[PDB]
Amino acid sequence: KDIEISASESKFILEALRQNYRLDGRSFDQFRDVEITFGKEFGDVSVKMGNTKVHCRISCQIAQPYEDRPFEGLFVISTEISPMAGSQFENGNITGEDEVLCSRIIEKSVRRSGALDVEGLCIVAGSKCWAVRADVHFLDCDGGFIDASCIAVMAGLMHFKKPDITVHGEQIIVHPVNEREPVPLGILHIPICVTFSFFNPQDTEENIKGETNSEISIIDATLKEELLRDGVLTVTLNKNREVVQVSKAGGLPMDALTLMKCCHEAYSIIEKITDQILQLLKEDSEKRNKYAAMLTSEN
Amino acid sequence: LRRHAAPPSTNFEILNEMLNTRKNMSISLESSKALADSLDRCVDPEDPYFNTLVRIMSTRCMMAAQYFYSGAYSYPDFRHYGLAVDIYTHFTSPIRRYCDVVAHRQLAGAIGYEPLSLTHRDKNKMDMICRNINRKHRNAQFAGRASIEYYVGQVMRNNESTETGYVIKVFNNGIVVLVPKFGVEGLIRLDNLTEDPNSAAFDEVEYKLTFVPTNSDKPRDVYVFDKVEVQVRSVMDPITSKRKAELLLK
């Protein structure tokens, strides 16, 4: 199912960019306000960027590690799309170009990067371990799925707490949360994705052989801006001033110095976002403790 | 960071055994404060140094403090028993300790002065740094104590003097006395301890060693923690070439 875009809409949105205008009123370098809401259970997190709505759920269960890695636990990230985010998405389409890319960006940002301490997921070596699962649910699409998911996964992992397990011999003793408190996960670093969208205001000839560069780049594009772009760049960083991953899979040829500028611009955003996540986690912890005190008092 | 493990009960069971038997006292081991209070009241009125002797002896049964990185252990394991603090680190001596240097770089990144180097954010590299400085720390104190041992051994090289000694170990092959004046422990073998080694008896229950002195003929019972007069003397062993301090009690 296709999204029909008129010539008028194509010309208007592009011309607006030539006049430093974007429809939502943002700034070319302006990232959308990210809202993070935690549910009752640990690992339940809802991320909202403008109209974009994503929900992540962290879960874990006792499992056996692979033969190759007897000291490491299991960790998987699911990002199956559904027609709920729009009829443009086919139900279960996990092989489409954009889907596989998004799936690979998140994987290289969280899994491959070792954001989660999988070594601390091991209960007994080569026998029993924890299997952490991150399920991302794309509720409403207005662009920026990759950035929304990376925040949803990370906020969830940092908010999630696994039940205490004591092990004797073969036997496993899964302590319920009420009897003893659950244990948080180990996070080595906090990866954040920032996606750039590129627009060629002129023709291909002036992009390939043109002297002065004039390609437009905006941060965190909406759906309309996303459907009219000529190239995409997703750069992942952390507060430690290091690039976790960069992916410009083809698209509009872009100047190297411009791509470097984007990486430095993204670093200022990931700093604000990371601190934001941490603060919302503290307040959530203070909220749960204050209610625990008001529950014990009256009790 | 730097942690200090709580001492096992097995380490103090032998000390409390000698205390409850001879001096009729005990160390609580229930908590660090309990261990401190019971160690504090462990004092003999006839000899003020008795309390010091117990302290320097209960120090030998403490677990070795070690450096580590916060990702290697959980928060309750950050506990430092000897200081009773939830968390602790070395930071005040960069010049003579490399651990402080690491702490300095981490604090600089903590306040935002300068980004922390990648080498101090790698769990693998941090494990190598900790295991190294832990080994270098042990080698430092041992070399330091050995330096004291040599120079003190050279002071008593050609000198004999009746000093004050304290029995710290009682065995059937002899006794071990400590001289606080020189800070040197000595071993008195049964052959050089008394005459007629077949007449001497060792009671493990009371840690008592009864024997008849070479210059006497009266059965003397030597218990533990006793303040005894000891003649000091140094002699290099012709096999080990180590300056040992041969002690003869009186």
- Interface with chain A: mutation pick from B123, B124, B125, B127, highest number of A CBs within 10 Å: B123
B interface test, pick of A116, A239, A240 with most B CB neighbours within 10 Å: A240
**Full domain range(s) for residue A77:** 1-299
Closest residue in A to B115 (Cα) is: A240
Report CB contact under 8 Å: A117, B115.
Answer: no
In angstroms, rounded to a whole number, what is the distance separating the alpha carbons of residues B206 and B18? 8
Nearest to B202 by CA among B160, B238, B225, B173: B173
Q: What whole-number distance in Å separates Cα of residue A213 and Cα of residue A64?
A: 54
Q: How far apart are CA B6 and CA A232, in angstroms?
A: 56
* Category of A56 on φ-ψ map: left (φ > 0), alpha (ψ -120 to 50) or beta: beta
How big is the CA angle at B97 (ends B94 and B100), to the nearest 5 degrees? 50
Q: How far apart are the first and last CA of chain A?
A: 57
For A139, residues 6+ apart whose C-beta sits below 8 A from its C-beta are A53, A54, A55, A84, A85
Question: For tokens 């875009």, what's the residue?
Answer: A5
Task: Give B205-243 as a DSSP string.
Answer: TTTEEEEB-TT--S-EEE-SS-EEEEE--EEE-TTT--E
Cα torsion B161, B162, B163, B167: sign: positive
Please report, for residues A30, A48, A65, A136, A190, the alpha-carbon distance to residue A154 in angstroms, rounded to integers and kept in the order given.
Answer: 22, 14, 23, 11, 7
B→A interface, C-beta within 8 Å: 71, 115-116, 118, 121, 123
Structural domain boundaries, residue B207: 161-250
Residue type, B28: S
State the DSSP H helix or E strand holding residue B52, giving kind and residue range, or none if neither: helix B49-58
Q: What angle do CA B178, B179, B182 make, to 5 degrees?
A: 130
| Chain A closest-CA separation from residue B201 CA (Å) | 47
State phi, psi for B124 to the nearest 5 degrees. Answer: -75, -45
DSSP labels, B83-120: TTBS-----S-TTT-HHHHHHHHHHHHHHTSSPPPGGG
* Three-point CA angle A87, A93, A96, nearest 5°: 100
- Cβ contact, residue pair B116, A240, below 8 Å: yes
Helix-, strand-, coil-residue percentages of chain B, each rounded to 5 = 35, 20, 40
* B70 contacts on A by Cβ (under 8 Å): none
Q: How many domains does chain A have?
A: 1
Q: Return the SS3 of B179.
A: strand
Would you say A164 and A175 are in contact if contact means Cβ atoms under 8 Å apart? yes
The CATH number of the domain holding residue B237 is: 2.40.50.140
**Cα angle vertex A40, ends A39, A46, to 5°?**
5
d(CA A104, CA A113): 12
CB B59 within 8 A of CB B65: no
- Which helix (DSSP H) or strand (DSSP E) does residue A267 occupy? helix A256-298
User: Using N-to-C axis directions, what is the helix angle for A256-298 and A145-159, rounded to 10°?
Assistant: 40
- The alpha-carbon gap from B122 to the nearest alpha carbon of chain A, in Å, equals 9
The dihedral through the CA atoms of A171, A175, A176, A182 has a sign that is negative
- What resolution in angstroms does the PDB record give? 3.8
Residues of chain A in contact with residue B123, where contact means CB-CB under 8 angstroms, are: 188
Residue of B nearest to A184 (CA): B74
Q: Assign residue A150 the CATH number of its domain.
A: 3.30.230.70
Chain A residues bordering chain B (beta-carbon distance below 8 Å): 117, 186, 188-189, 240-242
Asked whether the beta carbons of residue B115 and residue A240 sit closer than 8 angstroms, the reply is yes
